Amino acid sequence: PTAVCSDGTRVSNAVCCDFVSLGQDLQSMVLQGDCGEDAHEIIRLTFHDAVAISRKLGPSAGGGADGSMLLFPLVEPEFAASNGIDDSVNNLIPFLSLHPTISAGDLVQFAGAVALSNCPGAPRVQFLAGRPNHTIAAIDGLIPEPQDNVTSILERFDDAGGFTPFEVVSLLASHTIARADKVDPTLDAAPFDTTPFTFDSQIFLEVLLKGVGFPGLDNNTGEVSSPLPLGDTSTGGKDTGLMRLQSDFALAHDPRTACFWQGFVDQQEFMSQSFASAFAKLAVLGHNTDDLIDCSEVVPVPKPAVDKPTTFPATTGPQDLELSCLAERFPTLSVDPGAQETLIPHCSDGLENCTSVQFSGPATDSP
Template identity: 45%
Template sequence: MSFKAIVALVTLAVATYAAPSHTCGAGRVVSNAACCKWFDVLDDLQANLFDGGECGEETHESLRLTFHDAIGFSPKLFREGKFGGGGADGSIMAFAQIETNFHANIGVDEIVETQRPFALKHEVSFGDFIQFAGAVALRRNRHYLRPHGRCWVHPNEVVDLLISHTVAAQDHVDPTIPGTPFDSTPSKFDAQFFVETLLVGILFPGNGSNVGEELSPLGGEFRLQSDAEIARDPRTACEWQSFITDHTSMVSKFERVMSKLAVLGHNPADLIDCSEVIPVPAAVNIAAATLPAGKSRADVQAACAATPFPTLSTAPGPATTIAPVPPS
């Protein structure tokens, strides 16, 4: 599918923007008239998909969908003269009966079917809509995406993408406990996820070990096996640990890697940047990461050889347990 219309990247205003020269409905202005229709999409999403701007299930799933649509792209196959996928092209929505049945895409069928009527209603491409909806979803967590290059260059970027798991919860790995969060603050982009993934696992929150699940350190918390492995892998452990105390770096790296993901498989020069449509959210305060109540430094499996594990305070109170994320 062609991805020629609009790249929905959430950005800060930059000097390269031309002065707005087109007036849309309700007095809103844009640099390119083609962006006006995206205000209608934005208003519809905020009112009818994202519950008036709440950071709920559709918000999390829309963010997840940006990755699952874009990541099916292989430069290696293209170099071999084979088709390597279309990247961020909307194929997961256009060919949902095929792609959502892949095991790696388990659970995304729900958000695909929820989003499709919006894209059809506003007559925008599936690829554009998926990235735009994900960008609007990110707006609920006060994060922005800036356009950069188009190729993964380092294993650390895998870690940077997993910053999205700071707002994640599982539904399908263990279907007996839907809405099980990945950390104790599942509605914020903060560092607690990176601390808790490094704690010794002691239990399963549901019916025991499932494919892709690892022992968790806290009651009611879910841990993906892949998160546990990447957090402890020598190639990625230091990047993982760095986010515990450097929230600014976490934000900027997530912005960069998600911007690359949004145009994967395409040339940004061929696209229209309508990021100015995305509203800028109010500032939020992010608390410093702590060891959960009932845990100590002895529970940490530090894996970064180059840098000592940071000194953290311990949250007060009885041992931490996590409640499921309520469905929206």
């Protein structure tokens, strides 16, 4: 039966109402309404928590979206594939006691939904509640790494939850708001696209440009050359140059995924809807949706997509593209004016001095 919540929201089930105050606390205490560092790491955690599940190995290998990352913070966060995930994990642990009617699995996925809503252009994702509050730690080896090839990547997603190559590329839209802190031991927050605080299709276009150099070292595992490597870090600045993952490069050029990859370029609505569909499927891995309840209405309405069209970043152009998809012509797009590479801002407000909430906690990371 229906009820209305404290902020006035109509809900199909009154047990959805407990998520209202949780969302408010996630914003006030961690996310701060920003599509910033803390939001990005929390979105990354939804994937690390959910994908640790295997059809072929059976339930003992992992329970998927079950909050195992939070309930066993001394196990999975410290596996090599998850180096750096401790930040999100430690930020979320306190909410377990603060909102004890909400399972760790629900907490992770709801935090991800709220985090996404802070990012201009992101979809309002489905949110189902009712994941059980108990599980066990997954085994190591279930999380794809940037050095993995496409066959491996596709097999892992298929084994986790029957994701198709389209769904995999759709999920990787998330790298439109992604940066790397661990891939290069000399770099902090190296962005994967020129708008890491905007949920747009720049990532799809920019992975297709010819690489020309590196923002840091030239020999990091899982990293390939970037088309826009220049930053201001060599002189003490925080605007790290753009980084490209080997896995993104490979997905953009593999015959199984290349057309899906390019298909999202300058297709904002198609990209956000496709991400939303694949993400909703990721969010319930390890669960039958019949055992869950629909609490989608308590997901905040996201910031709207920006006005700006998809364009070539300064100093780049269509002549720099490496195309692989024969089925669809790459669209004609404007080029941003400028003779020099434009620094990619370290903060959503365009400055370099922003700071982020970080709670201390039991999960740890390595350099």
